[PDB]
Design a protein around this ligand. Structure first.
Ligand code: 5JK
Ligand SMILES: *[C@@H]1O[C@H](CO)[C@@H](O[C@@H]2O[C@H](CO)[C@@H](O)[C@H](O)[C@H]2NC(C)=O)[C@H](O)[C@H]1NC(C)=O
Ligand code: 5K9
Ligand code: CA
Ligand code: ZN
Ligand code: ZN
Length: 776
């Protein structure tokens, strides 16, 4: 019934037994003397010279007695004030080429220092403001920014960091959510979040325990001062080998709290940042005191950024909907709508109704695929993507203001995760991280694999690309290998005569076009390689269209028209059986479906070669509304990119994701066909556009690193997503494409293909390339 000698113990305790641990306050379970014994604060957190050599007083928050080093409970500045040592931050950067750990350490510990709402740009404040953090950043490995997941809220991003999973897979899809199977709601405040039923995946602290690596408790009741959290981690590090954890986590609620109150830009943000730096300094001073400052790996990481948002920039559903009292809204920097009613009516009422409307409604299946925010029963079908700096609310009455008329907050977050203000920080420091090294920005889903590597753990299955972050680490125990191709292509010659085709249609070396090798098909299927003067394709005899079409456009390439006599021309391909070709009469009978081509006739190298572009094996089903988008991309944008990037290689193709799980559909999952036909209708079309990062070299003669931009365009029968679509395509199509930017890895998941298999680059480098997102 007493916490004597068990303050912040690692041994778990059950009810009704009173507890003395990190979370006993959060479970209303602390022993009567927890606050007295474990939350001491007398004399503060810093030794002073007058305290050096004191007789131990068990009342003090920390100790400066000669016995404190053996007891493991000195104040973090004890050796500086009492033994003449230097603060860690005052010491010169020295490379840590191998760990320097006490005998009996079996691995270098990992300490995760997480900060809430730490915007990437805050790092541009001085060593003046954050000298300890700046030394970690400059001496260790850092990225200019780390990209959070959507929504850019605390619980989804912390749990993604811990699991390597998109929120739709780990289940924490918001700070609040409703689960219809549970018939219950989850909120940041309250006891519901403590129920294990909500939490999927396998977080780092569980992966470690299952594999025999002890974790310190990652979570801290708000009642525990930051200084005491640091001292507790330092005390655990002095435990004996059979008890000492290998992995630890510190969490700070700052700078998120002051960011909400004052916004991200005020001078008021300086002192919160100074206080975080002071806490980092206590940790590093304390590690140096224990001679562990060249043994431990430290990660300084944020969950999301912070944007300028005031209650004066709020859109109200009551200005759009006939009755907002038959709906429930998750409001704020995003919107989720459910019935408290008809979805199609609601979407229409929210679509391009006011000139500068500051949100856009989506059925969740139509959200940009890069958000990976659909495949979970907790994600409402109706979603509102809110413009940065804005809020959406149900009615004007939901906006609260002070008596003076000013809002209660000036900052918020939650927006689209490619928004610059939502980016956050990553620094890694220690023997296993690289020395004085800058790495490209990366997504927070990748970090779980790295933390597993740092601890010698086998990661649970996750959404990271293991290997894509090897360049962060000085020593790699994981070496990725390219997946073996599952299906091998056929190379069919001239097989049939034109007169053998049914078929409804009427019409009046490959060193150049496959620059990085043939894509590997990673599932069983039947497909043909087809060569042409201007493009190469892998044609699926199962889906009756190419899985991929590859072609290279030089800087000097000319765009030409489709001659009038060829406007409706479609030609049989004598290499491919009539039984494995599309049927032109199907498109005539489908009044709502037209077709387009994957290699564009506009980019043919000659009038003779243009006929190849009209082969039935180059044709794909396209809604007339989508053809406006695709024709502009094909006729205008490809040439633009080629002219800007010193040539481009393009790989385009279809995607089928009817169950919106981000993975290629099986034939049985396809829910729409061209009417009366076996021709499946894609849900999306992709394109991957590659050139030389060194733009002084043409795309086809690139010696070094590659540059890539890709897209996954929704194949929709209207352009309701584009409020300016009544105008010329030059006014809206490129904005649509930028919203639907994607990683090559995203396309690989959705197609079952593997790209960049034949290059001069290391596989590690290619994995980094495949996880790149061009954000615009
Ligand atoms: C009130 C705050 C200060 C702290 C709230 C912490 C709460 C979210 C934490 C406390 C214990 C956590 C669970 C615990 O680690 C057991 C697991 C196993 C894992 O397999 C799934 C996650 C889960 C349920 C943790 C979820 C987060 C919890 C509830
Ligand atoms: C993200 O990672 C998860 C975990 O590996 C993937 O979900 C797994 O998907 C397989 C294949 O469908 C299922 O058998 C498992 O049940 C899933 N596990 C979990 C925990 O979700 C998911 O497909 C990945 N997402 C993307 C877009 O690739
Ligand atoms: C995996 C390495 C990086 C971070 C680990 C970590 C530490 C945490 O403290 C928390 C994490 C994650 O995620 C959840 C559980 C959603 C939390 C919700 C409440 C907050 C007060 C603290 C929490
Ligand atoms: Ca699918
Ligand atoms: Zn947060
Ligand atoms: Zn916040």
């Amino acid at each position: 019934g007493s916490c004597k000698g068990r303050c912040f113990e690692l041994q778990e305790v059950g009810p009704p037994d009173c507890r003395c641990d990190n979370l006993c306050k959060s479970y209303s379970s602390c022993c009567h003397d927890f606050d007295e014994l474990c939350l001491k604060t007398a004399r503060g957190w810093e030794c002073t010279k007058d305290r050096c050599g004191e007789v131990r007083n068990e009342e003090n928050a920390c100790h400066c007695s000669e016995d404190c080093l053996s007891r493991g409970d000195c104040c973090t500045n004890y050796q500086v004030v009492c033994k003449g040592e230097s603060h860690w931050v005052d010491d010169d950067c020295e490379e840590i080429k191998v760990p320097e750990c006490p005998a009996g350490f079996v691995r270098p510990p990992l300490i995760i220092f997480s900060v809430d709402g730490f915007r990437a740009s805050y790092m541009k404040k001085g060593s003046k403001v954050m000298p300890n953090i700046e030394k970690l950043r400059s001496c260790g490995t850092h990225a200019p920014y780390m990209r959070p997941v959507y929504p850019t809220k605390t619980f989804p991003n912390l749990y993604t960091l811990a699991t390597g999973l998109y929120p739709e897979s780990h289940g924490i899809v918001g700070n609040s959510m409703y689960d219809p199977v549970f018939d219950a709601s989850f909120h940041l405040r309250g006891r519901e979040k403590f129920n294990h039923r909500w939490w999927g995946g396998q977080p780092l602290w569980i992966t470690a325990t299952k594999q025999g690596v002890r974790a310190g408790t990652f979570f801290w009741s708000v009642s525990i001062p930051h200084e005491r959290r640091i001292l507790t981690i330092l005390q655990w590090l002095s435990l004996p080998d059979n008890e000492r954890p290998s992995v630890y986590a510190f969490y700070s609620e700052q700078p998120d709290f002051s960011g909400h109150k004052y916004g991200p830009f005020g001078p008021e943000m300086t002192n919160p940042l100074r206080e975080i730096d002071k806490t980092v300094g206590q940790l590093m001073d304390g590690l140096k005191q224990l001679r562990l400052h060249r043994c431990v790996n430290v990660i300084f990481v944020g969950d999301h950024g912070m944007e300028d948002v005031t209650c004066d920039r709020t859109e109200f559903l009551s200005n759009y909907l006939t009755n907002v009292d038959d709906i429930t809204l998750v409001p704020g920097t995003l919107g989720r709508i459910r019935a408290k009613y008809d979805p199609k009516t609601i979407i229409a009422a929210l679509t391009c109704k006011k000139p500068d409307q500051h949100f856009k409604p989506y059925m969740k299946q139509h959200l940009p695929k890069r958000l990976h925010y659909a495949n979970n029963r907790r994600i409402e079908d109706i979603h509102l993507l809110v413009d940065r700096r804005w809020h959406v609310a149900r009615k004007p009455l939901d906006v609260y203001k002070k008596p003076s008329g000013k809002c209660f907050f000036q900052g918020d977050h939650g927006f689209d995760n490619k928004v610059n203000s939502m980016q956050t920080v990553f620094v890694g420091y220690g023997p296993t991280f690289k020395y004085r090294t800058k790495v490209p920005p990366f997504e927070n889903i990748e970090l779980y694999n790295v933390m597993c590597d740092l601890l010698g753990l086998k990661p649970a299955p996750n959404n990271g690309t293991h290997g894509s972050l090897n360049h962060l680490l000085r020593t790699n125990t994981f070496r990725p290998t390219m997946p073996d191709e599952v299906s091998r292509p056929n190379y069919p010659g001239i097989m049939y005569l034109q007169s053998e085709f049914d078929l409804g249609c009427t019409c009046d070396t490959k060193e150049r076009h496959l620059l990085y090798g043939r894509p590997a098909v990673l599932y069983r299927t039947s497909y043909d390689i087809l060569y042409h003067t201007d493009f190469e394709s892998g044609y699926s005899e199962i889906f009756l269209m190419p899985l991929w079409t590859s072609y290279t456009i030089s800087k000097q390439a000319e765009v030409s028209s489709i001659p009038e006599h060829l406007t409706n021309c479609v030609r049989p391909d004598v290499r491919v059986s009539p039984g494995f070709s599309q049927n032109c009469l199907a498109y005539k009978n489908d009044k709502q479906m037209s077709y387009g081509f994957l290699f564009p006739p506009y980019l043919s190298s000659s009038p003779e070669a243009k006929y190849d572009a009209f082969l039935v094996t180059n044709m794909v089903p396209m809604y007339p509304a989508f053809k406006r988008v695709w024709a502009y991309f094909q006729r205008v944008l490809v040439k633009k990119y080629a002219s800007e990037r010193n040539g481009v290689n393009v790989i385009s193709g279809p995607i089928f994701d009817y169950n919106y799980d981000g993975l290629r559909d099986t034939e049985d999952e396809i829910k729409q066909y061209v009417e009366g036909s076996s021709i499946p209708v894609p849900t999306h079309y992709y394109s991957i556009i590659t050139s030389c990062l060194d733009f002084t070299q043409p795309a086809d003669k690139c010696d070094g690193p590659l540059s890539v931009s890709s897209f996954i365009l929704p194949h929709r029968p209207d352009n309701d997503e584009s409020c300016a679509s009544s105008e010329d395509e030059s006014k809206w199509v490129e904005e649509l494409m930028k919203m639907h930017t994607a990683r090559v890895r995203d396309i690989e998941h959705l197609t079952g293909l593997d790209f960049y298999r034949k290059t001069s680059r290391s596989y590690s480098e290619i994995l980094t390339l495949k996880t790149y997102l061009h954000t615009y």
